[PDB]
Design a protein around this ligand. Structure first.
Ligand SMILES: Nc1nc2c(ncn2[C@@H]2O[C@H](COP(=O)(O)OP(=O)(O)NP(=O)(O)O)[C@@H](O)[C@H]2O)c(=O)[nH]1
Ligand SMILES: [Mg+2]
Lengths: 161, 157
């Protein structure tokens, strides 16, 4: 059973999903993701859905994405019957197996049967140039823990052509 | 910094979170942000009767407690008073600075700040720093100055 400390020192994207979707006995379900340019107020990306492979998104961003000063990332998720203690996300972003950013966020308690929201209001010229040249080599792993137990692993790659 | 935003259902907590297309919160809304050179993590927890026993699940580590009042909801002020005083005796909130937003000041019969101060029994409070601040959450009026004061007070510690 993988834990936070197990993914905090990873130096590359994982070649495989680190838990089976059955691990998700809390029925944490992401039903909406939205990304906003805080300067112009343009929605850059939105995906919605009611209410060991896990989830995957291939994002289609522009070269300008990488020059933005401020972005807002919103998540909505519903939760099942059981309480969820110590809900926690670690998200690691890699370009060509070289860590770019790590986000470690402690959501806390999730009330049984809830719809919850989290909004986060959050680069070298050679890095920008290489990332625009090499689509889908920017990759991310999102790990969700519940009381230090991995229950969900989502993956993503990114384009900036 | 960790801020916890509570009050009765319909008080305008979520409206506040969003302004500083809207629905009753059956669970929470977190907003995370840089302001006055601080990383602010804010939890807007729902206020309908049956969510309230789960409030205590967000007490730990709170620096700043925003209590939000529908100032026209005069039939429920005493429930609001009642809910507030409980929080204040909870050991996990021993630290917190208290900011009261007396919301919906735009509504014709909105109780004044002073009326709310008397009704909520704010003078009884010996043990947390506090400020009552009128606002209309729908307009954006009087929110930041309210928060700004919260952070400065927390910032002294
Ligand atoms: N007239 C007026 N209406 C307001 C004001 N602030 C909020 N409201 C209204 O109050 C209603 C409920 O607001 P909301 O922000 O969802 O309240 P809440 O406390 O977050 N609800 P819950 O506790 O159920 O999560 C909405 O119709 C909203 O427009 C205000 O300053 N003036
Ligand atoms: Mg709400």
């Amino acid at each position: 059973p993988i834990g936070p400390e197990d993914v905090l020192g990873l130096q590359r994207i994982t070649g495989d999903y680190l838990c089976s979707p059955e691990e998700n006995i809390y029925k944490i379900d992401f039903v909406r993701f939205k990304i906003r340019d805080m300067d112009s107020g343009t929605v850059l990306f939105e995906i919605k859905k009611p209410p060991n492979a896990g989830r995957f998104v291939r994002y289609q961003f522009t070269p300008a994405f990488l020059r933005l000063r401020q972005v807002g990332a919103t998540v909505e998720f519903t939760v099942g019957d059981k309480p969820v203690n110590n809900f926690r996300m670690i998200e690691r972003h890699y370009f060509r197996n070289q860590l770019l950013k790590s986000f470690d966020f402690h959501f806390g308690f999730c009330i049984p049967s809830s719809k919850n929201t989290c909004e986060h209001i959050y680069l070298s010229e050679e890095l920008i140039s290489e990332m625009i040249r090499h689509p889908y080599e920017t990759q991310s792993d999102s790990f969700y823990f519940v009381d230090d137990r991995l229950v969900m692993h989502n993956k993503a790659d990114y384009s900036y052509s | 910094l960790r801020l916890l935003m509570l009050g009765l259902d319909n008080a305008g907590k979520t409206t506040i979170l969003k302004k500083f297309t809207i629905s009753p919160t059956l669970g929470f809304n977190i907003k995370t942000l840089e302001h006055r050179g601080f990383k602010l993590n804010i939890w807007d927890v729902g206020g309908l009767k049956s969510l309230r026993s789960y409030w205590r699940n967000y007490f730990e580590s709170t620096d700043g407690l925003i209590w939000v009042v529908d100032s026209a909801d005069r039939q429920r002020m005493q429930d609001c008073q009642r809910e507030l005083q409980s929080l204040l005796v909870e050991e996990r909130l021993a630290g917190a600075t208290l900011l009261i937003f007396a919301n919906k000041q735009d509504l014709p019969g909105a109780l004044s700040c002073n009326a709310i101060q008397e009704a909520l029994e704010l003078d009884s409070i010996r043990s947390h720093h506090w400020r009552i601040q009128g606002c209309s959450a729908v307009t954006g009026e009087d929110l930041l100055p309210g928060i700004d004061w919260l952070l400065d007070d927390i910032s002294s510690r």
